[PDB]
Write an enzyme that holds these catalytic residues in place. Structure first.
Site, PDB file in Angstrom:
ATOM      1  N   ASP A  83       0.867  -1.180   0.000  1.00 46.72           N
ATOM      2  CA  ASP A  83       0.000   0.000   0.000  1.00 46.72           C
ATOM      3  C   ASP A  83       0.907   1.234   0.000  1.00 46.72           C
ATOM      4  O   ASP A  83       1.806   1.304  -0.855  1.00 46.72           O
ATOM      5  CB  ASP A  83      -0.966  -0.148   1.171  1.00 46.72           C
ATOM      6  CG  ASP A  83      -2.030   0.912   1.179  1.00 46.72           C
ATOM      7  OD1 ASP A  83      -1.806   1.948   1.827  1.00 46.72           O
ATOM      8  OD2 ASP A  83      -3.083   0.700   0.549  1.00 46.72           O
ATOM      9  N   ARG A  84       0.737   2.199   0.921  1.00 47.74           N
ATOM     10  CA  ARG A  84       1.599   3.387   0.900  1.00 47.74           C
ATOM     11  C   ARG A  84       3.080   3.002   0.887  1.00 47.74           C
ATOM     12  O   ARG A  84       3.874   3.574   0.124  1.00 47.74           O
ATOM     13  CB  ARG A  84       1.313   4.301   2.094  1.00 47.74           C
ATOM     14  CG  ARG A  84      -0.147   4.738   2.281  1.00 47.74           C
ATOM     15  CD  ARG A  84      -0.866   5.037   0.968  1.00 47.74           C
ATOM     16  NE  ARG A  84      -0.658   6.397   0.476  1.00 47.74           N
ATOM     17  CZ  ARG A  84      -1.222   6.882  -0.628  1.00 47.74           C
ATOM     18  NH1 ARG A  84      -2.015   6.111  -1.359  1.00 47.74           N
ATOM     19  NH2 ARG A  84      -0.988   8.128  -1.002  1.00 47.74           N
ATOM     20  N   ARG A 129       4.319   2.221  -2.369  1.00 46.62           N
ATOM     21  CA  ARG A 129       4.539   3.439  -3.148  1.00 46.62           C
ATOM     22  C   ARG A 129       5.881   4.079  -2.815  1.00 46.62           C
ATOM     23  O   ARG A 129       6.635   4.460  -3.721  1.00 46.62           O
ATOM     24  CB  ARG A 129       3.391   4.421  -2.918  1.00 46.62           C
ATOM     25  CG  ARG A 129       2.040   3.755  -3.001  1.00 46.62           C
ATOM     26  CD  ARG A 129       0.883   4.673  -3.409  1.00 46.62           C
ATOM     27  NE  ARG A 129      -0.199   3.758  -3.729  1.00 46.62           N
ATOM     28  CZ  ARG A 129      -0.480   3.316  -4.945  1.00 46.62           C
ATOM     29  NH1 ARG A 129       0.178   3.786  -6.007  1.00 46.62           N
ATOM     30  NH2 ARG A 129      -1.441   2.414  -5.092  1.00 46.62           N
ATOM     31  N   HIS A 170     -11.562   7.192  -1.757  1.00 44.91           N
ATOM     32  CA  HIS A 170     -10.767   7.815  -0.707  1.00 44.91           C
ATOM     33  C   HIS A 170      -9.534   8.500  -1.275  1.00 44.91           C
ATOM     34  O   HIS A 170      -9.023   9.441  -0.654  1.00 44.91           O
ATOM     35  CB  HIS A 170     -10.394   6.791   0.378  1.00 44.91           C
ATOM     36  CG  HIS A 170      -9.597   5.624  -0.123  1.00 44.91           C
ATOM     37  ND1 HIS A 170     -10.117   4.676  -0.975  1.00 44.91           N
ATOM     38  CD2 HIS A 170      -8.313   5.260   0.108  1.00 44.91           C
ATOM     39  CE1 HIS A 170      -9.189   3.775  -1.248  1.00 44.91           C
ATOM     40  NE2 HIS A 170      -8.085   4.106  -0.601  1.00 44.91           N
ATOM     41  N   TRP A 171      -9.073   8.089  -2.463  1.00 46.44           N
ATOM     42  CA  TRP A 171      -7.962   8.794  -3.096  1.00 46.44           C
ATOM     43  C   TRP A 171      -8.303  10.251  -3.376  1.00 46.44           C
ATOM     44  O   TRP A 171      -7.432  11.118  -3.269  1.00 46.44           O
ATOM     45  CB  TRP A 171      -7.558   8.077  -4.374  1.00 46.44           C
ATOM     46  CG  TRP A 171      -6.590   6.988  -4.082  1.00 46.44           C
ATOM     47  CD1 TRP A 171      -6.734   5.997  -3.158  1.00 46.44           C
ATOM     48  CD2 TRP A 171      -5.323   6.780  -4.704  1.00 46.44           C
ATOM     49  NE1 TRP A 171      -5.632   5.175  -3.171  1.00 46.44           N
ATOM     50  CE2 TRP A 171      -4.748   5.643  -4.108  1.00 46.44           C
ATOM     51  CE3 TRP A 171      -4.623   7.440  -5.720  1.00 46.44           C
ATOM     52  CZ2 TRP A 171      -3.508   5.155  -4.486  1.00 46.44           C
ATOM     53  CZ3 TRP A 171      -3.395   6.957  -6.091  1.00 46.44           C
ATOM     54  CH2 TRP A 171      -2.845   5.827  -5.471  1.00 46.44           C
ATOM     55  N   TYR A 221      -2.080  11.287   1.344  1.00 44.02           N
ATOM     56  CA  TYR A 221      -2.972  11.194   0.195  1.00 44.02           C
ATOM     57  C   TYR A 221      -2.940  12.452  -0.656  1.00 44.02           C
ATOM     58  O   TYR A 221      -3.126  12.375  -1.873  1.00 44.02           O
ATOM     59  CB  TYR A 221      -4.384  10.874   0.668  1.00 44.02           C
ATOM     60  CG  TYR A 221      -4.561   9.382   0.795  1.00 44.02           C
ATOM     61  CD1 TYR A 221      -4.225   8.726   1.976  1.00 44.02           C
ATOM     62  CD2 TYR A 221      -4.994   8.614  -0.287  1.00 44.02           C
ATOM     63  CE1 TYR A 221      -4.363   7.341   2.104  1.00 44.02           C
ATOM     64  CE2 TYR A 221      -5.125   7.226  -0.172  1.00 44.02           C
ATOM     65  CZ  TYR A 221      -4.817   6.605   1.031  1.00 44.02           C
ATOM     66  OH  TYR A 221      -4.954   5.242   1.157  1.00 44.02           O
ATOM     67  N   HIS A 236      -7.107  -6.864  -0.117  1.00 44.28           N
ATOM     68  CA  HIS A 236      -5.988  -5.940  -0.220  1.00 44.28           C
ATOM     69  C   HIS A 236      -4.870  -6.282   0.753  1.00 44.28           C
ATOM     70  O   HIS A 236      -3.695  -6.030   0.456  1.00 44.28           O
ATOM     71  CB  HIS A 236      -6.488  -4.515   0.027  1.00 44.28           C
ATOM     72  CG  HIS A 236      -5.406  -3.485   0.058  1.00 44.28           C
ATOM     73  ND1 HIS A 236      -4.602  -3.224  -1.029  1.00 44.28           N
ATOM     74  CD2 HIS A 236      -5.008  -2.631   1.035  1.00 44.28           C
ATOM     75  CE1 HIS A 236      -3.763  -2.246  -0.730  1.00 44.28           C
ATOM     76  NE2 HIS A 236      -3.986  -1.874   0.516  1.00 44.28           N
TER      77      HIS A 236
END
Lengths: 297, 298
Positions: free
Chosen positions: B107-108, B111, B152-153, B216, B277
């Protein structure tokens, strides 16, 4: 506690088979229905309605489920809050007053009711005016990073209950004020009458009213989109003479050229920008009233 | 809060941007694990011990998350851009003497991880990313269906304090709804309730929630722009890379994950895992097996 912003307008509770529509009624002449949007109530027309009432019987209605109109029970398809169902309910409301052929001006959600009404029942309308929208299909079709950020609330309020209801409950006063301010040109609340803002805030303080608004946006993401899609694919157009107004710094122009878009949806459409944010009738009441009056007369 | 890494040490690593908190365990080549949203390092608690049999495992809270310090953000959300986070974690790993290491992120943190591999590929021996496509790819595929799926993005990237004010009315509701809604089952049954307590506590802190929105916001702006520079310039991750995704996760809803990653990485292999996820919690054995197999290969 709540100021009456329509001096000399009567107040009507119009019965329909889905519930009552609240309206302020004033003026004299051919009937003109005025439909507000989100997150407002009928009082958003308070600065232009008196000038329309000089030449028309102006009917300033709360949308089904908004303001003081009854809130019909929703269902899994959000049916009562689809623009098709709202349009049918307002037609019934107008039939209750003997208005089966009327003019219509709508802003925001009410403008979505309005163009759907014109697609479904064009014989009901003499002339249509839409304020600062493109068709719901056009927003979803253009969905990209830029518009996802700018109209995030189309995706946020359409999430399944109770997710947006719960989060709106976190600070409803902040939210309704933030929506009001952030869509104006000025970026604050100074373009609004504080008495109108109080109407909007109290409407937004009711958890059931906020739930209706979510149902509206859920419809906007699903059935409303599917209904628009059928018309584009069938090539169905609005045959009613139409005026499209948009704010130079509003929602509609940010995604496309609104008159160019509306010509794909309508056979007879004129359009004009107003120096304003989204809330044309409150940020630019003289310009908006002027253009409405000429178009409708 | 429970200790979910029995036998792992606890380290507070100083960096120029603030302290990074990490559980450390095992021995062997260094392996950094990076959680994402709305989680903390403890999401790795079911796979880290299996990893610790073969690797020195460093389980870090992202800058601003969990127990790591929260650098003050700015108008461009700089400290919470993946580029800045990657630089901070490189600094952190240098404080441990790890200038070349393996990296898995979720997830984050995934990234951060691929951004790391683009900016400083010489720091990575191998890279695994869990259930993500690059940030650019999510935004580029942002049509109606996807905007509704990962609303939510767009919502969390709204300017402060809008998402913060709405999240603060009932933070417990939101963090549990996000944990639940992204799992295969759609409830909290996959998670260790001790882990959920870690997540809920971290989320109860308004400053932590702000940082997540800042994350975000960077993800909608600078992160996007950095990725955009790399795709349009044809820059590919040169590090051997494993792309893992859940068959019911977020990455696969957008596109076919391996196909996308081949546009971004010159040496990528990929495997679905039957999971939502949250791969290391919903499918800990299969995730751990894939990671062990991948990192101990060449």
């Amino acid at each position: 506690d709540l100021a009456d912003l329509f001096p000399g307008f009567g107040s009507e509770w119009i019965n329909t088979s889905s519930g009552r529509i609240f309206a302020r009624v004033g003026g004299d002449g051919p009937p003109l229905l005025l439909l507000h949007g989100f997150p407002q109530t009928h009082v958003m027309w308070h600065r232009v309605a008196p000038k329309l009432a000089e030449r028309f019987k102006v009917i300033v209605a709360d949308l089904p489920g908004y303001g003081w109109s009854d809130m019909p029970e929703s269902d899994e398809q959000h049916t009562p809050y689809t623009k098709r169902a709202m349009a049918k309910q307002l037609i019934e409301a107008m039939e209750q007053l003997g208005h089966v052929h009327f003019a219509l001006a709508g802003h925001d959600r009410g403008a979505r009711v309005s163009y759907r009404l014109a697609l479904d029942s064009p014989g009901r309308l003499s002339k249509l005016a839409v304020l600062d929208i493109l068709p719901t299909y056009e927003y979803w079709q253009r969905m990209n990073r830029a518009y996802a950020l700018k109209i995030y609330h189309w995706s946020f309020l359409a999430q399944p209950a109770p997710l947006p209801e719960n989060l709106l409950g976190g600070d409803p006063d902040f939210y309704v004020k933030a929506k009001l301010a952030s869509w104006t040109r000025a970026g604050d609340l100074s373009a609004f009458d504080p008495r109108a803002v109080e109407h909007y805030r109290i409407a937004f303080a009711d958890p059931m009213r906020r739930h209706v608004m979510c149902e509206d946006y859920r419809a906007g993401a699903y059935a409303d989109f599917e209904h628009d899609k059928i018309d584009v694919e069938a090539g169905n157009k609005i045959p009613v003479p139409m005026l499209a107004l948009w704010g130079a710094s509003g929602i509609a122009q940010s995604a496309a050229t609104p008159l160019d878009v509306w010509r794909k949806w309508a056979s007879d459409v004129q359009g004009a920008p107003i120096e304003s944010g989204h809330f044309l009738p409150e940020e630019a009441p003289d310009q908006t009233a002027e253009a409405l009056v000429r178009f409708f007369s």
